Design a binder for this molecule. Structure first.
Ligand SMILES: [K+]
Lengths: 201, 167, 89, 82, 36, 47, 101
């Protein structure tokens, strides 16, 4: 068994190829199967596409192709192949990611804060495909990954989960007031900047 | 300088090279190539070309890649052979690195090869030849007969070549 | 009881031996055709298996040349070909 | 207690020799389609070989397309059991 | 009644299993003619 | 399978063997097709 | 690439027991995975399939090679060996080793 390109990245509705290069066989038989978390299905069996997908999916025992895709088709594929009866055997796994860009994410701003107390800022997004990281702003400009440095920001302090949005003013300062925003992006398509909101100290 | 040879069939260009001997294998070497019942070409850009594709654009790094071109009629994710070339029948399969936005990719291309392994000549199936509307053609005359001028050509993934016909 | 006890499993032990000399006889009987249902295919690829060959080691072979319409499609094209050049200038 | 072993060992001669008799059916049921196939390829193979080479543009050599010799593979797939 | 019961039931198998082969023996015969 | 595996990779090797020294090639007998009826005894007729 | 990976094998386990086989590598950059053999032929990702291994029972930690046999069937005897690969260079293989029920 052998392949050429496991880390496939595609938009929605657009094609794919899933190489399954095998060698050394006489009367082989091919087995594709879908997989994503809990979900499992057969795409092929005995060099023949399964009826759930044949209406759009093609076949070739070098590898298959989708005439079109959806985000549901994302997951993990595995071209299990065997000689006639398991005299010889191999495997290979491929995992996929359809590229849905993110959307205008949901935001989470306590618009007022107590100074010396703690505020929490989070952002949230649905169409992360792959999961759309977040990068925070203040007053239009972008907030660091760490406030430590010649930032004009190290006087304040916070902690991030930039992929998730968990921004915390640990603690809040009177200086910390401004206009904040999360900037959503999965490294594909445009970054979806969110609604900007104040933070009254 | 645009060429004249359609695809054989409908196909969805979506991936990489692949050829298999015996309809039961996959092979990547010379002795396996010649050591072959037949050749199958389980590829998605089979009867295509190998142009160079400088692949420029405004504000686009991720350096140029190779192209693949024929005439064909395009339907929303695929192509089908048409031989009556018009402004719509042009075809390309170069990855110009397009994310979620119009690209405006200027390009230049130079005829450089072929893809359709398993074939053994070009310019022999007239039905696949690209003509606008009319195909010039003759037959024997007097007792004289026509000819072609053979001209070897590249193939791509495999080191071999294949034989063109030329008028 | 011991006389039976080892014979209780002698048969099932023969059942192991039995299916396997029935297997090998099946392993080759199908394989007799696996040899045969593709040696015949080579006769279908008579020419190209000789021409994809000699072109590989390493000759200049040029079978494409022919002159006589002995195919019934070639002349039938010539019927129409001579019929069009006649009317059309 | 020699009965339960004979009730089953009837019984192993039985379904074994069954398979033996079954497999000898595919010994010849496969043989006939290993022969009746010939009389199609006796005509059909050449029809396809010439339908193949015409794709490229080769000569056809309209005397050697019909094998007629190597299609004496019937000669070994002919029974005379005895 | 072991040596009177399970001696005749086997005879049916000993009977039938031959007659199976008698067909397959008969089968090659008329199949040869069809093959001839 | 060795037969059909040779069957091109004989003559090929044989020619490339000979041509390394620079013989005349005899461009018909490179391929033999008769000696490669040694399938005929390597065929089953199991019976 | 992967270096030649370390392994650990009990040469013989008890029938119907539990057993574990591992394969470890140091120079994996990126981290070398691990895939096992048995009499040469590469082992499936699960015994659950028409593999000849439907009777057997195990799991894999292919990034770790932590191969299980829980339980250890009688037929699980074989010549087991791991094949380290980070998908770069060449898949490197460990020593030839047996296991017995
Ligand atoms: K560029």
């Amino acid at each position: 068994v052998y392949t050429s390109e496991p880390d496939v990245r595609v938009p929605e509705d657009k094609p794919a190829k899933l190489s399954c290069s095998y060698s050394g066989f006489s009367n082989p038989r091919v087995e594709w199967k879908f997989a994503h978390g809990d979900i499992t299905s057969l795409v092929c069996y005995k060099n023949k596409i399964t009826a759930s997908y044949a209406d759009r999916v093609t076949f070739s025992h070098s590898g298959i192709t989708f005439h079109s895709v959806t985000r549901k088709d994302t997951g993990t594929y595995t071209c299990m192949v065997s000689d006639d009866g398991g005299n010889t055997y191999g495997e290979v796994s491929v995992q996929l990611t359809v590229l849905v860009p993110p959307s205008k994410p949901t935001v989470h701003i306590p618009s007022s804060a107590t100074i010396g107390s703690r505020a929490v800022l989070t952002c949230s997004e649905k169409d992360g495909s792959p999961p759309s990281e977040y990068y925070w702003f203040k007053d239009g400009v972008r907030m660091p990954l760490e406030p430590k440095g010649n930032r004009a920001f190290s006087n304040s302090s916070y902690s991030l989960n930039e992929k998730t949005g968990e921004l915390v003013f640990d603690p809040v300062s009177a200086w910390d007031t401004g206009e904040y925003t999360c900037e959503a992006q999965n490294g594909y398509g445009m970054p979806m900047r969110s609604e900007a909101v104040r933070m009254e100290a | 300088g645009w060429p004249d040879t359609t695809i054989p069939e409908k196909l969805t260009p979506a991936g990489d090279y692949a050829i298999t001997n015996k309809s039961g294998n996959d092979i990547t070497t010379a002795a396996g190539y010649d050591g072959a019942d037949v050749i199958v070409n389980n590829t998605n850009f089979k009867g295509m070309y190998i142009c160079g594709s400088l692949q420029r654009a405004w504000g686009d790094k991720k350096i140029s890649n190779t192209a693949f071109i024929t005439t064909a009629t395009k339907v929303d994710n695929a192509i089908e052979p048409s031989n009556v070339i018009d402004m719509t029948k042009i075809a390309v399969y170069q990855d110009t690195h397009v994310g979620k936005e119009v690209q405006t990719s200027d390009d230049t291309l130079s005829l450089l090869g072929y893809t359709g392994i398993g074939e053994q000549a070009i310019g022999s199936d007239r039905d696949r030849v690209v003509r606008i509307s009319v195909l010039p053609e003759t037959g024997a005359r007097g007792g004289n007969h026509p000819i072609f001028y053979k001209n070897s050509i590249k193939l791509g993934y495999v080191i071999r070549s294949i034989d063109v016909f030329n008028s | 009881a011991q006389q039976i006890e080892l014979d209780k499993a002698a048969l099932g032990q023969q059942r192991e031996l039995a299916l396997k000399r029935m297997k090998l006889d099946h392993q080759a009987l199908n394989n007799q055709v696996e040899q045969f249902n593709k040696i015949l295919e080579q006769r279908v690829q008579g020419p190209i298996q000789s021409v994809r060959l000699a072109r590989a080691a390493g000759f200049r072979v040029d079978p494409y040349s022919y002159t006589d319409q002995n195919f019934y499609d070639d002349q039938l094209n010539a019927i129409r070909l001579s019929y069009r050049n006649l009317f059309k200038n």
